Amino acid sequence: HTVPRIKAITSKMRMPKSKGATVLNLEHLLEYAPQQIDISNTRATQSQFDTWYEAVQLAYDIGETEMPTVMNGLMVWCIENGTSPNINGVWVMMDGDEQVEYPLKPIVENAKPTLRQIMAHFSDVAEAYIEMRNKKEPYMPRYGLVRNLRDGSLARYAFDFYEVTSRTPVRAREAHIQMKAAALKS
Amino acid sequence: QIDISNTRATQSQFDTWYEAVQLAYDIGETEMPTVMNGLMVWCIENGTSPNINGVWVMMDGDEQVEYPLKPIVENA
Amino acid sequence: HTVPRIKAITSKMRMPKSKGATVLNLEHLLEYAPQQIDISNTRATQSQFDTWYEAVQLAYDIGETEMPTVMNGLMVWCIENGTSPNINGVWVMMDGDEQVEYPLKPIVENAKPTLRQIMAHFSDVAEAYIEMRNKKEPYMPRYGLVRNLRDGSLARYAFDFYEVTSRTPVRAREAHIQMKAAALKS
Amino acid sequence: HTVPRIKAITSKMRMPKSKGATVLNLEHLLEYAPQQIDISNTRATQSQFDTWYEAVQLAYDIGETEMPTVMNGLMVWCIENGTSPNINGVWVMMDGDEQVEYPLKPIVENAKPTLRQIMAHFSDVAEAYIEMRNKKEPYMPRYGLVRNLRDGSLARYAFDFYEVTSRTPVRAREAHIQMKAAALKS
RNA sequence: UUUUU
RNA sequence: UUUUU
RNA sequence: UUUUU
RNA sequence: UUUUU
RNA sequence: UUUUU
């Protein structure tokens, strides 16, 4: 009489078995819903990110409360300039009309496995920041200018450490693939 | 078709790998299937090349737990 | 009833967190609006520029009031001739119909990290100066002639130390990319 | 139900055993976290450093309070000039515009196993000092000039007694390897 | 910049 | 990033 | 995976 | 078959 | 390890 429903994982499906015992736990698998970025190797683990954050905070001898401002400045600077392992010298923050420099050693030396993977944690906020800045003036990150990005509307994706995810425009995905290929090309 | 395909590890090889990875983690019979769920999802996201090294990640809710990748690749 | 607005940075966005504490300061990030050229590594820092300016002023034994004229002349000379680290000898100013030479050592030796990055601070004024000079006669900087720039309308961008920014024509950006590639090519 | 964690040192690992008894103490090994430079033979032991410091202080008949200034001067002088066992004569400090010389015998004779290994204790402070000096003028240590170091940004690593550690740039590591090979080459 | 006989 | 004289 | 300054 | 991180 | 003045 009633219309019969179907289970997400069908009852009769070939399953990995060891010693004639199912190797997976379906009860947990159905409820296991980890975000794509939390189980990606292209992004530094939470432990690695915490280690790097603590190391950089200790290197600058900066307190807990002041560190987030430094992190805002570092994210913006990385948005402008690449996050390669080779960057050296000092990165710059603007305290209004005054320029303050911080050493880049602590950031690159403690960033494991890479500074790009560490900054991947800031990818969404970098997107939002570029969106905000573009709402008030033409703000193409310098990485996009180096790559000769002509779209202009792709500025929000045109930084070195952008983490490509499932919920990104296909246009943005293709643009970033092309940009990475061009940058890696000698 | 999949039980007589060389593109798929034999049942004996799969059992050997499963036992080796279970022994490497010092994990019991009951807890291993959860680790296998996490490993399958991680492999779904990231490739299954012989070169993958470091740690693969499971999510115990909002907490990230890492397991060494050596036992998985060396015994496979 | 009323149409509901949306925040620039959405409330529910993945954020970098260390020890279950947000790593960024949104209050400051929203108000953090640093110019693109003030946080660019392709441009010498303000401290480095001040150090170079002071060093060059002291080398010439020139006063505070007379230095800006020397800087005008140096900017024009760099517009004509490249800003490579190799330039040696004397650069030239015109005191009317009289030619006065200044040693190039102090300019190149004190210019850190590079003379190009130091002259990047003069990029906008160089643009304006080339515009002005072109309004009265054909004035293509010698760097554009060496690069065989045929457009003519791109003269305003055809100098060695032009700082490419977000608000530059796409035509100018492509032209300068091609010119830099040609110059670096052996 | 819960996701099972793993121990840093797995329970079932082959261990060195003598007479069927584990030779290592895991409890202490897990907590044993000695800095890399504190267990390196390329650096004089703390006892050797104390012996050398006491010997040099006694040779100069200088008090406890005045010795650190002499040590600052000696570190800077060693930064400029090499720390070979052959250096003889007097090393120089600047008391403003006045030059004061100290005999080099006490420093080299009491420095065991080598003066380079003794000065390795000053490596980090030498790095910082070169960084500071470079922030105000081009300051390449004379050892870098003798080695013909062209990078300029590597000045902070371009002294004889630099102690290569895990947290040093790969660029700096390669540069110092090349510099040491060139210096040792006849 | 030099290197155009 | 540098390498455009 | 890394390699995008 | 392997080689897809 | 030493050998870098």
Numbering used by the authors:
A (entry chain Ag), C (entry chain Ae), D (entry chain Au): 42 to 227
B (entry chain Ai): 77 to 152
Sentences from the paper on this structure:
We prepared VLPs consisting of the CP units lacking 40 C-terminal residues, i.e whole C-IDR (CPΔC40), and analyzed them by cryo-EM. Interestingly, we detected only two different architectures of filaments. 65% of them had the stacked-ring architecture (VLPΔC40:r) and 35% had left-handed helical symmetry and encapsidated RNA (VLPΔC40:h+RNA). The structures of the CPΔC40:r and CPΔC40:h+RNA subunits and the helical parameters of their VLPs were comparable to those of their wild type counterparts. This indicates that luminal C-IDR is not essential either for filament formation or RNA encapsidation. The absence of C-IDR facilitates the accessibility of the RNA-binding site, resulting in a significantly increased proportion of VLPΔC40:h+RNA filaments. VLPΔC40:r and VLPΔC40:h+RNA filaments are long flexible and hollow nanotubes with an inner dimeter of 4.1 nm and 3.7 nm, respectively. Third, we show that RNA can be encapsidated in VLPs even in the absence of C-IDR. Here we show that C-IDR does not play an essential structural role in the filament formation or RNA-encapsidation, however, it does affect the fine structural details in filament architecture.
